[PDB]
Ligand binder design. Structure first.
Ligand SMILES: *C[C@@](*)(O)[C@H](CCCNC(N)=[NH2+])NC(=O)[C@@H]1CCCN1C(=O)[C@H](N)Cc1ccccc1
Ligand SMILES: [K+]
Ligand code: NA
Lengths: 251, 27
DNA sequence: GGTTGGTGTGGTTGG
């Protein structure tokens, strides 16, 4: 996260760290959507151009965290994965279309003040929140700047959703209905972006109708980080919800 | 269930430091 | 240190 600030304790209790078993390293963010399911970006798990192809036994998740690298005794919880599901139409060859994956935990996690699931939007929530100029919030432990670095605790920044024609005009990469973009315009006089290492983490919005946090997006891609005239791209959760529901129903 | 309602914020009637900025953006 | 920094009559938590 670029130009954000340190999270408060328990501010993002659905935030999940995806961690490679060996060598031990932070891969990506992710989010907790029930006691057994964790949502992330598909490219965190599968991206052949960078020789990445992780399965369940390569990985673990860490839930409840605030410090990036310290093991937070008696707070954080660590889960093995029973299974990984990548969207079958995830397009890594071109533009990361459908950059979404589900990970099923081997055992349900026990909730706490630090560990609690986010809501997924229904059709009505998505229609009313996902509008140009409304702000949501991104969180992560990724880079503080483009590299050409690492925070010591979870970072947060709030960013406005951007009009689709402005998103489309900002890049040559083909934008689809499975994506949206967020970030200030050059002249807007605020800054901030997600960055490398933030993929998989949630773009959330707080409903003014019921006071609940909804995950509208997943950090997916960008060109550089926090550049003027560029914006962060996010997987559109509601658009892929039939697939999320299909996998949780069937498995 | 109580998805989306944070134990240390909405459940205690406490606001975090920047959520008002999100609420204001809807105005 | 440790599945872990830099300091705790801990802390988002013991000894
Ligand atoms: C894997 C994630 O951490 C990372 C998030 C980047 C978010 N950036 C900004 N400014 N908000 N995603 C990536 O690094 C993705 C994975 C593959 C390369 N990539 C990119 O963002 C490239 N910089 C652009 C791109 C290349 C190929 C296909 C689509 C986008
Ligand atoms: K200690
Ligand atoms: Na920008």
């Amino acid at each position: 996260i670029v130009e954000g600030s340190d999270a408060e304790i328990g501010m993002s209790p659905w935030q999940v760290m995806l961690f490679r078993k060996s060598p031990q390293e932070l891969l990506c963010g992710a989010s907790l959507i029930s006691d057994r399911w964790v949502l992330t970006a598909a490219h965190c798990l599968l991206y052949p151009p960078w020789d990445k192809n992780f399965t369940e036994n390569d990985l673990l998740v860490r839930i409840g965290k605030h410090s990036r690298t310290r093991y937070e005794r008696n707070i954080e919880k660590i889960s093995m994965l029973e299974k990984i599901y990548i969207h079958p139409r995830y397009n890594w060859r071109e533009n990361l279309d459908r950059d979404i994956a589900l990970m099923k935990l081997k055992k349900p996690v026990a909730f706490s003040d630090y560990i609690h699931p986010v809501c997924l939007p229904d059709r009505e929530t998505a229609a009313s929140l996902l509008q140009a100029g409304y702000k949501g919030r991104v969180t992560g432990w990724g880079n503080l700047k483009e590299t050409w670095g690492q925070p010591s605790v979870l970072q947060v920044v709030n960013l406005p959703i951007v009009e689709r024609p402005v998103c489309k005009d900002s890049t040559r990469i083909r934008i689809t209905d499975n994506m949206f973009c967020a970030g200030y315009k050059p002249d807007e006089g605020k800054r901030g972006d997600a960055c490398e290492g933030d993929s998989g983490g949630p773009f959330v919005m707080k409903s003014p109708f019921n006071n609940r946090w909804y995950q509208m997006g997943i950090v997916s891609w960008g060109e550089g980080c926090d550049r003027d005239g560029k914006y962060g791209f996010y997987t559109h959760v509601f658009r892929l919800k039939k697939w999320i529901q299909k996998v949780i129903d069937q498995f | 269930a109580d998805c989306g309602l944070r134990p240390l914020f909405e459940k205690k009637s406490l606001e975090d430091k920047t959520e008002r900025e999100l609420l204001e953006s809807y105005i």
